[PDB]
Amino acid sequence: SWLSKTAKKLENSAKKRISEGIAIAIQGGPR
């Protein structure tokens, strides 16, 4: 995973970890 050292209420790198799963989830989802 890595990254996301701080996201208690800022989310600086938490959007990168999701961009991996959300990228494939939508790539083959209902869109």
Task: Name the DSSP class of 5.
Answer: S
Q: Residue 12 carries which side chain, given as an amino acid letter?
A: N
Tokens at 12, concatenated: 């600086």
Q: How many residues does the chain have?
A: 31
| b (16+ CB within 10 A) / e for 5-22 | eeeeeeeeeeeeeeeeee
Query: Residue 4, exposed/middle/buried by CB under 10 A (0-12, 13-18, 19+)?
Result: middle
Alpha helices, DSSP H, located in 1-31:
14-27
d(CA 24, CA 2): 19
d(CA 28, CA 11): 26
- Residue 29 phi/psi, 5-degree rounding, is -110, -165
Give the technique used to solve this structure: NMR
